[PDB]
Amino acid sequence: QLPADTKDAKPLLKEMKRGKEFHVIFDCSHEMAAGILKQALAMGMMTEYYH
Amino acid sequence: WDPASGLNMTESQKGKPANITDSLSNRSLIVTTILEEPYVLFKKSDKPLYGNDRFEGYCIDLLRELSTILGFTYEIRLVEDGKYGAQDDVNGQWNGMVRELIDHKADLAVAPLAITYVREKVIDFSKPFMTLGISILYRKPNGTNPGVFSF
Amino acid sequence: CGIWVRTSNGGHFASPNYPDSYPPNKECIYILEAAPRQRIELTFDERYYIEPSFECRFDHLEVRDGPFGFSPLIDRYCGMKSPALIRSTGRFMWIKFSSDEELEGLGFRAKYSFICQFELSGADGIVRSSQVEQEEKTKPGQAVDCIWTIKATPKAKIYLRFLDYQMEHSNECKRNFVAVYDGSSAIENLKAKFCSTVANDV
Amino acid sequence: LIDSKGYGVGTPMGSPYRDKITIAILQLQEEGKLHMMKEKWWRGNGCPEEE
Ligand SMILES: *[C@@H]1O[C@H](CO)[C@@H](O)[C@H](O)[C@H]1NC(C)=O
């Protein structure tokens, strides 16, 4: 679950990359979708492996 | 259960500790030896050894053969102090291995053990697996002929 | 990262690049040494006061009392909360700050206040066995233990060779053992510990 | 001696004499008297014909 506040997936996305979790579904008002893709790119998650 | 502590289940320590008198078991056997050199020695290693594997010896793998052909358990418990089991007259005691051959703290004690007259009086010994005896030790001569008259 | 803060009644102790986010991949030591009979009071100033809902690894500031390494673990702090002030009379609060491979934070600010280890460095030398009746004469009755610090020449890794090793008092080591630590002197990484007849070189 | 072996005293699987005769044999060994009987039977005619 996304933390309710701070919109900060850095802990969350780090947890994700730890498990080598190469598939994700989302559920969010698309604002959060955009605001989190930038997070993913900054964390370098943006590699052709994830879909 | 509480929000704070958790489940104080009363079985964490069972009221009646389960106990069964007769179940599958092995009859373990205690042997008593000594750190004699080409007989029984600490196995050579750098990492720690544990249990019976700390040792090594010609005697110990002899016991390995014995247990292999008859079936036993290894409690290689060393003697307290270095001594051929030999009684004392004054104390009447049998300090050394003979204690464990008497007091049934232990069992058969495989180690350098001369089956002598007094020992069989107080212990029972199997027939010797290898004989012994006394010889002289000497430095073999060297090519330093006297040469006063080496002709 | 090293800010040698030795011999101060008080002084500033802080994470590198403190007002900025701390750099990544940094495993840097800090050591606080107190003179005999003194007390160490460590003041720690948090930059940011929030309440996290979780505790995690990858960025942890632990505190150790004594020979870094031997030192029993006191506690292992993380997050953005300010740890409570630590008062002990162990006289050696030695504190290590780590770093993961990413995910830097606001860092930290601290303030130290004040109220058997022999140096042995160079190019070559020998650690005298049981050499304790001269350095720190410890009576034989109690358990004794000591640590030895090596510093090679600048740009020099070190090789050790044991000339004489015999720990009679057991094959096991729940009482007596000899061990080697690489890196700096922490419990972080045992290069090796020796409990048997033979001790290999390292 | 390529191999080592000796002799014995045959007794039935139940024999009260086995242990006591073992004791006596060992004791005689201590005095080495059995050695002297052997020598009278061996050494006596051992070397009266040393060539
Ligand atoms: C568990 O129950 C026992 C008996 O009522 C009580 O003495 C003990 O304090 C309890 N412990 C906890 C964790 O609540």
Which residue of chain C has the CA closest to A13? C103
Question: What residues of D are in contact with residue B131 (Cβ under 8 Å)?
Answer: 4, 6
Residue C117, classed as helix, strand or coil, is strand
Residue D18, classed as helix, strand or coil, is helix
Compute the nearest-CA separation of B50 from chain C (Å).
8
- C-beta of B8 in contact with ligand 1 (< 6 A): yes
Cα–chain center distance at D22: 11
- The residues, any chain, with a CB within 8 Å of residue B42's CB and separated by 6 or more, are B35, B49, B54, B55, B56, C171, C197
How many other C-beta atoms are found inside a 10 Å radius of the C-beta of residue B63? 21
Q: For tokens 């010609």, name the residue.
A: B58
Spell out where chain A is interrupted, by the residue before each break (C to N > 2.5 A).
none
Nearest to B28 by CA among B91, B69, B71, B83: B71
Interface test with C, best of A10, A16, A17 (most C CBs within 10 A): A10
Taking CA atoms only, the protein residue closest to ligand 1 atom 8 is B8
**Sheet bearing C28-33, strands edge to edge:** C28-33, C92-97, C61-65, C73-77
- Give the single-character DSSP code of B61: H
Q: At what angle do helices D17-31 and D33-41 cross, to 10 degrees?
A: 80
Ligand 1 pocket test, candidate residues B2, B8, B12, B13, most atoms within 8 A of CB: B8
The alpha-carbon radius of gyration of chain B (Å, integer) is 26
Q: How far is residue B39's CA from residue B63's CA, in Å, rounded to a whole number?
A: 12
The torsion angle over the Cα atoms of residues B70, B74, B78 and B83, rounded to 10 degrees, is 0
* A12, B39, B124 from B71: Cα distances, Å: 59, 22, 20
Check CB contact of C198 with chain B, cutoff 8 Å. Answer: yes
* A10, B65, B85, B124, C62 from C81: Cα distances, Å: 18, 65, 69, 75, 14
Q: For tokens 């060779």, name the residue.
A: C161
